Symmetry: C2
Subunit: 73 residues, 2 copies
C-alpha cells in the first residue's frame, strides 16, 4: 500500500514526500520503520530523475539532504 | 544497501529470499522491520515475473504464500 505511493513524472519530490509519510502515518508506522522506509522505499518509488539523484546520494542521507538534492528535477 | 539486493533475471525467488533476509540480518533489522520489508522491498526488488506475481498476490501475503506463487519462476 505504501508500495502504491509512487512519485508522479513531474510531481515535485516534496509533494511525493508528504504522500509517502502521510500514508505511513495512516498505517501507524513506527519510528524505526519510517527510518528504514526513508532509505529504501522512498527511494525506489521516486520518479526516474529523483531516483537517480537519491541513489547517487546513497544510504544514510537525511530527508533534508534528499530534498535539497531533488529541488528542481 | 538492501536497496541493492535485486533478484537475478533467472535466479529462483527462493535464492533471492535468502540474500534479502541475509542482508537484513547483517543490518540487525528488527522483527517489525522484516515484516514491513517482506511486503515492500522484497516485492519491488523481485525480477519482472516475480514482481508481477507478488503484486498480484497483494499486501499481507505471507512469505510462504509469496514462495508458492513464485515457484516455477
Amino acid at each position: 500500500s505504501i508500495l502504491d505511493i509512487r512519485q508522479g513524472p513531474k510531481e515535485p519530490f516534496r509533494d511525493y514526500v508528504d504522500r509517502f509519510y502521510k500514508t505511513l502515518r495512516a498505517e501507524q508506522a513506527s519510528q524505526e520503520v519510517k527510518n528504514w522506509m526513508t532509505a529504501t522505499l522512498l527511494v525506489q518509488n521516486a520518479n526516474p530523475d529523483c531516483k537517480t539523484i537519491l541513489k547517487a546520494l546513497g544510504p544514510g542521507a537525511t530527508l533534508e539532504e534528499m530534498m535539497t538534492a531533488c529541488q528542481g528535477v
